[PDB]
Amino acid sequence: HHHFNLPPGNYKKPKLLYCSNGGHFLRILPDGTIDGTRDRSDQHIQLQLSAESVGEVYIKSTETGQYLAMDTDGLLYGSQTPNEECLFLERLEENHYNTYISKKHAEKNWFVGLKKNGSCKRGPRTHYGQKAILFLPLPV
């Protein structure tokens, strides 16, 4: 129930997921907390993406091995093991950016998103058209 415009680029190397909204890099902390930071020297912003199926990815911390995941109430968290809450539909947006929709809650359009203050957005609060959901994958 979603378009299938996919972004270029591959998953060969790790990446930083830069959010245009506030200019924060998606960060996965050791305690499982998820947020954003502007500090490019941070050791928890290096992410390795992998495709489980065409257009479906896992997003993992290279530093801690944790998987980005969105829970039943729309909150992002770091998971120690891969589960259905760790799969995201990676799509092109505005002919330029990358967006990540929770596969588990795809029917409700719950996106991975960062606010201007660097805090994560809760699933139900995200939607097409926001800058919070637009990411650019940059080399590490």
Curated annotation (Swiss-Prot):
Annotated PROSITE patterns: HBGF_FGF
Principal localisation: secreted
- Superkingdom of this protein's organism: Eukaryota
Family designation: Belongs to the heparin-binding growth factors family.
Binding locations of heparin: N21
PANTHER family referenced in this protein's UniProt entry, alphabetically? FIBROBLAST GROWTH FACTOR
- CDD domains named in the record: beta-trefoil_FGF1
Which cellular components does GO assign to this protein?
cell cortex; cytoplasm; cytosol; extracellular matrix; extracellular region; extracellular space; nucleoplasm; nucleus
- Per the record, which residues fall in region Heparin-binding? 115-131
Gene giving rise to this polypeptide: FGF1
* Motif Nuclear localization signal in this chain: 12-15
Q: Outcome of altering N98A?
A: No effect on integrin-binding. No effect on integrin- and heparin-binding, loss of FGFR1-binding, defective in inducing FGF1 signaling, cell proliferation and cell migration
- GO terms classed as biological process: activation of protein kinase B activity; anatomical structure morphogenesis; angiogenesis; branch elongation involved in ureteric bud branching; cellular response to heat; epithelial cell proliferation; fibroblast growth factor receptor signaling pathway; lung development
Q: Where in the cell is it found?
A: Secreted; Cytoplasm; Cytoplasm, Cell cortex; Cytoplasm, Cytosol
- Stated consequence of mutating K115E: Reduced integrin-binding. Defective in integrin-, heparin- and FGFR1-binding, and defective in inducing FGF1 signaling, cell proliferation and cell migration
Q: Which keywords does this chain's UniProt record carry? A: Acetylation, Angiogenesis, Cytoplasm, Developmental protein, Differentiation, Growth factor, Heparin-binding, Mitogen, Nucleus, Phosphoprotein, Secreted
Q: GO molecular function, one example?
A: S100 protein binding
- Tell me which tissues or organs this protein is expressed in: Predominantly expressed in kidney and brain. Detected at much lower levels in heart and skeletal muscle.
Its subunit composition reads: Monomer. Homodimer. Interacts with FGFR1, FGFR2, FGFR3 and FGFR4. Affinity between fibroblast growth factors (FGFs) and their receptors is increased by heparan sulfate glycosaminoglycans that function as coreceptors. Found in a complex with FGFBP1, FGF1 and FGF2. Interacts with FGFBP1. Part of a Cu(2+)-dependent multiprotein aggregate containing FGF1, S100A13 and SYT1. Interacts with SYT1. Interacts with S100A13. Interacts with LRRC59. Interacts with CSNKA, CSNKB and FIBP. While binding with LRRC59, CSNKA and FIBP seem mutually exclusive, CSNKB and FIBP may cooperatively interact with FGF1.
Explain the purpose of this protein. Answer: Plays an important role in the regulation of cell survival, cell division, angiogenesis, cell differentiation and cell migration. Functions as a potent mitogen in vitro. Acts as a ligand for FGFR1 and integrins. Binds to FGFR1 in the presence of heparin leading to FGFR1 dimerization and activation via sequential autophosphorylation on tyrosine residues which act as docking sites for interacting proteins, leading to the activation of several signaling cascades. Binds to integrin ITGAV:ITGB3.
Q: Which cysteines are joined by disulfide bonds?
A: none
Outcome of swapping R38E:
Dominant-negative mutant. Defective in integrin-binding and in ternary complex formation with integrin and FGFR1. No effect on heparin- and FGFR1-binding. Defective in inducing FGF1 signaling, cell proliferation and cell migration
Q: Write down what this protein is called.
A: Fibroblast growth factor 1
